[PDB]
Amino acid sequence: ARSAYSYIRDAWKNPGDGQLAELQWQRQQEWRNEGAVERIERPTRLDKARSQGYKAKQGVIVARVSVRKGSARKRRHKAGRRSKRQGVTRITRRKDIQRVAEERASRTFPNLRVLNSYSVGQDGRQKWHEVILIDPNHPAIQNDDDLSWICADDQADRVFRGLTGAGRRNRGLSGKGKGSEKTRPSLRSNGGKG
């Protein structure tokens, strides 16, 4: 039958209706007063967490990040940068907020590696994401048959090289066919036209 999990999930399908609506209105007040990276004992969205790879083990950390909202905060132009080149309040950046989050998080934890992240709400001027990080040095995880992969030296700073799932989903790598000619196998490998 339905798993208790499928309930948490089925609820966040519309974080603005019912109990969850009352929760967020409350939590946020507390959230809005927390740092920019708060570690938390348990994931707010359990289904999602586990689903994304979470495990109630040793070395599996969760942290809620809070990034300022908006689009782009771009200066005008020092020298003589023409019209098509005067970006300031009408353009946005090529990296989505969740990626910014994942990064700030991994920095706060200079030894942990990003596993994944999820949204947990957003008031009128900031977005919150919980990021699942992992200690590649705790044997507790070095042994785990489902997570020991995140230990390869070539997984170091995996988030800063866009290896997160959201990382890849942003580098235009979702589709295996049409419209991904300039993305895969690498944006840089494609003279950045993706």
Partner 1 sequence: PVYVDFDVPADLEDDALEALEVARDTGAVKKGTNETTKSIERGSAELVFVAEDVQPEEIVMHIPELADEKGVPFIFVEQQDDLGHAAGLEVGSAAAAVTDAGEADADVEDIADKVEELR
Partner RNA sequence: CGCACGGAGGCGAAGAACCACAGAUUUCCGAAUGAGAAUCUCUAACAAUUGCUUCGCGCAAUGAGGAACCCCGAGAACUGAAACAUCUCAGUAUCGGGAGGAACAGAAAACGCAACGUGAUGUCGUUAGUAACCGCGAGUGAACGCGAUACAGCCCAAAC
Partner RNA sequence: ACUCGUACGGUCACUGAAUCCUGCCCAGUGCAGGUAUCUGAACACCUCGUACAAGAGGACGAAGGACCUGUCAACGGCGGG
Partner RNA sequence: GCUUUACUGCAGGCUGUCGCUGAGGACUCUCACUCCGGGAGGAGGACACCGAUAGCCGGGCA
Strand 113-123 and strand 37-39: the pairing is unpaired
Contact 137, 111 (CB under 8 A): yes
Under rule CB under 8 A, residue 5 binds partner 1: yes
Question: Closest CB to Cl ion among 20 and 131?
Answer: 131
Interacting residues with partner 1 between 18 and 37 (CB under 8 A)? 19-20, 22-23, 26
Under rule CB under 8 A, residue 46 binds partner 1: yes
Q: Phi, psi (5° rounding) for residue 159?
A: -70, -40
Question: Closest CB to partner 1 among 11 and 100?
Answer: 11
Question: Closest CB to Na ion among 33 and 83?
Answer: 83
**Residue 106 contacts which entry, Mg ion, RNA, Cl ion, none (Cβ below 5-8 A, type-dependent):** Cl ion
Contact stretch for Cl ion (CB under 5 A) within 1-9, 36-44, 73-81, 109-117:
109-117
Under rule CB under 7 A, residue 14 binds RNA: no
One character per residue 62-101, x = contact with RNA (rule: CB under 7 A)? -------xxxx-x-xx-xxxxxxxxxxxx--xxx------
The rounded distance, in Å, linking the Cα atoms of 170 and 162 is 8
DSSP string, 72-140: ------SS---GGG--SSS---SS-HHHHHHHHHHHHSTT-EEEEEEEEEEETTEEEEEEEEE-TT-HH
Contact stretch for Na ion (CB under 5 A) within 62-70, 76-84, 101-109, 144-152:
101-109
Question: Closest CB to partner 1 among 57 and 95?
Answer: 57
> Euclidean distance between the first and final Cα of the chain, in Å?
43
Q: How many CB atoms lie within 10 A of CB 43?
A: 21
> Tokens for 168?
């890849």
Tokens 């997570």 correspond to what residue?
A: 147
Q: Which residues bind partner 1 (CB under 8 A)?
A: 1-5, 7-8, 11-12, 19-20, 22-23, 26, 42-46
Q: Which residues bind Sr ion (CB under 5 A)?
A: 157
